[PDB]
């Protein structure tokens, strides 16, 4: 029954194929869609079939599995938020002022999620755009640093 | 922080010597003839040396033109230079024939004159006698 349950869940949520995309065993090419027993698709269909055996309809089991894995997603998201909260202080320890007002924006960048701990998304589109934004920001940072270095050199030459 | 938590062992990232598609077993001699046609069409370059033909052509052109060779023999000279630069450190290939490589994969069908070898037993058998009592 997994042959059809996996097709249904994939058609509803195509983004599940990203997970473990580089791990041998998950064949996501068209015409196969055969994932490892530890893949999210396999876990979803296993839970759905377990509920069906317990005596629910296919659609009811689908909804129950969806709720269960949404709850799991929420748990992992809160764990990531706790890690980001820890990283906020870890980076704030780097401020010379702490060693009145903060003398850097790194804690705020970490809070926004651009610091040491980065957020988790549900789709690969989000990671694509996140990486593009990161590259653009880093190029702008290089330009700004060079401009300020030239500023300092000009000031020193003038003085 | 977030990132892959398993080894990047996908066979696309790490290509492996395998046939990803199966096919109904082919008669051994028919498959051998097809493979021979493929090899002939490819012209496996196992010649004395890739540079030998270029050198022969260059020498023949020089012999034909003993006076105006400087201007006549330029395409040949460039070809020989390219051949020396490319296949100068050329070693003849040392690999099994595709026929044997596919017999390994069991692509072909056993005919009257071709049978797959039986599994080895003498070489693979490992025996360890130990006392078992008390």
């Amino acid at each position: 029954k997994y042959l059809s349950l996996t097709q249904a869940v994939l058609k509803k949520y195509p983004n599940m194929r990203f997970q473990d995309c580089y791990v041998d065993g998950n064949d996501w090419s068209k015409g196969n869609d055969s994932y490892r027993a530890d893949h999210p698709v396999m876990q979803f269909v296993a839970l759905q079939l377990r509920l069906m055996n317990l005596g629910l309809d296919r659609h009811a089991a689908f909804r129950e599995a969806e709720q269960a894995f949404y709850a799991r997603r929420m748990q992992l998201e809160k764990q990531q938020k706790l890690n980001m909260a820890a990283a906020v202080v870890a980076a704030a320890a780097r401020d010379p002022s702490a060693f009145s007002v903060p003398s850097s924006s790194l804690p705020r960048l970490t809070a926004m999620g651009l610091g040491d701990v980065q957020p988790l998304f549900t789709s690969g589109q989000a990671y694509w755009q996140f990486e593009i934004a990161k590259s653009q920001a880093n190029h702008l940072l290089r330009i700004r640093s060079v401009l300020r270095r030239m500023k300092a050199q000009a000031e020193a030459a003038a003085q | 922080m977030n990132g892959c938590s398993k080894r990047k062992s996908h066979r696309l990232l790490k290509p492996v010597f395998e046939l990803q598609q199966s096919f109904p077993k082919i008669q051994h001699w028919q498959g051998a003839e097809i493979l021979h046609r493929l090899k002939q069409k490819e012209k496996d370059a196992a010649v004395i040396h890739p540079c030998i033909d270029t050198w022969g052509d260059y020498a023949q052109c020089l012999r034909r033109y003993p006076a105006t060779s400087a201007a006549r023999c330029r395409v040949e000279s460039d070809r020989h230079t390219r051949c020396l630069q490319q296949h100068g450190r050329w070693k003849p290939s040392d690999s099994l024939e595709a026929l044997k490589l596919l017999e390994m994969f069991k692509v072909f069908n056993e005919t009257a004159r071709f049978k797959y070898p039986p599994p080895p037993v003498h070489s693979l058998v490992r025996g360890c006698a130990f006392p078992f009592s008390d």
Partner: peptide
Amino acid sequence: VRTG
């Protein structure tokens, strides 16, 4: 381990 983190999400898998």
